[PDB]
Design a protein around this ligand. Structure first.
Ligand code: A1BQQ
Ligand code: ZN
Length: 139
């Protein structure tokens, strides 16, 4: 679990979005595993606007942060799960690092701010949904 809070927006994994997120829907994209909902309170986070390929992510299954080198956002095949059929997920970045299903939502950050959230993984890999291209999150 986990979310990004920026301005009057909450960014979460689309497969973990609550009834309240869908009732306050701003934008969602199944191909990216993202959903953005509106909030009443002002958010705590800054979004990075950069081309970094190194950063640090939070791994809830270890209660720890780990440094990572990650690929540029791209279209990557993701196996069928209980939430989606087998498909190409877009704007996805992979890295070597530990992850388990419940780690989705953990934030990846570089020196400029929030880069994205954990969305996929397996066998010593961790995949992050990029948010740096969503310029409208800051107005
Ligand atoms: C962090 O996820 C891990 C890690 C290790 C093993 C398995 C998983 C779980 C995983 O890959 N998914 C469950 C939801 C589905 C969402 C999506 N982006 O398509 C993908
Ligand atoms: Zn950066």
């Amino acid at each position: 679990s986990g979310a990004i809070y920026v301005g009057n927006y909450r960014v979460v994994n689309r497969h973990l979005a609550t009834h309240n997120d869908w009732a306050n829907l701003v934008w969602e994209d199944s191909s990216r595993d993202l959903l953005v909902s509106s909030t009443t309170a002002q958010g705590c986070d800054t979004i990075a606007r950069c081309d970094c390929q190194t950063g640090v992510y939070y791994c809830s299954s270890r209660r720890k942060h780990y440094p990572v080198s990650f690929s540029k956002p791209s279209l990557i095949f993701v196996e069928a799960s209980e939430y989606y059929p087998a498909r190409y997920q877009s704007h996805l970045m992979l890295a070597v690092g530990h992850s388990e299903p419940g780690d989705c939502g953990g934030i990846l950050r570089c020196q400029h701010g929030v880069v994205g959230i954990v969305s996929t993984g397996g066998n010593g890999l961790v995949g992050f949904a990029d948010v740096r291209d969503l310029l409208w999150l800051d107005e």
